[PDB]
């Protein structure tokens, strides 16, 4: 996260980190819990992953040294990606993780509601970005979970910014005008969490831009609301 700042603890409840083991331990994305037994996350995290035996999600975590080899996570049964993904920048980036095990809610750590579809109209004014990303262009994973506040770009203003883009209304952007916060490399894949009537909703996953932070680059996430039937279809199968 670029421009942001330190989270509290049990501030983003739904926030996980996924960690690769091959060829060695290391955070690969961010995710957001949304069931007892799943993981939402984005698409593009699993470049070249050819099993879920190699991943491991941490819940509950604020701290990155709060991991060692004794740490609690949980194993990864499967990886659903959405079959008309190909790349981030042509959309349909988004991916559930179903956890071998399920997740015991508590203070620490908790689902974040999805949109409602009857909440497509709703303007959202209270966005904010979560990860363990870099906090600058060439930078390392950071060890404190960041934040930032940023607003939402309408479909318009967004592909007014990215030209040579197709800007679909499966995507939402999110960015200042001038730049300066932004997700940036490590964060893909965490939420993009808006506070409505006093609930969080889980409004995109943080998915590419250009560069991190630029002028005139927002931020381009999965739009969650457009994916709500996909979600249940995955997630709610009989
Ligand atoms: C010590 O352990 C490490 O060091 N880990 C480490 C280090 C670096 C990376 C990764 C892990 N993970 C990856 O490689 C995976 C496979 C994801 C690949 C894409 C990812 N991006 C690209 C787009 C993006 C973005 C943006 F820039 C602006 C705005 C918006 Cl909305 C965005 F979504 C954010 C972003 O996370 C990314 C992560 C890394 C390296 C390069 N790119």
Known sequence: ?????????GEWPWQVTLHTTSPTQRHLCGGSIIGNQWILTAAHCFYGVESPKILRVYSGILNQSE?????SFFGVQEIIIHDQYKMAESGYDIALLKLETTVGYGDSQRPICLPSKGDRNVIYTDCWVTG???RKLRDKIQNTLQKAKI???????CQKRYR???ITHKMICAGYREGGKDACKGDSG???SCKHNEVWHLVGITSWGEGC??????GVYTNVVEYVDWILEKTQAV
């Open 132 to 134: 363990w990303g870099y």
């Open 67 to 71: 991991i060692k080899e004794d740490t």
């Open 190 to 192: 965490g939420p993009l």
């Open 164 to 166: 040579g883009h197709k």
């Open 213 to 218: 932070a630029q002028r005139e680059r927002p």
């Open 151 to 157: 607003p939402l770009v309408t479909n318009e203003e």
């Open 1 to 9: 996260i670029v421009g942001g700042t330190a989270s509290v603890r």
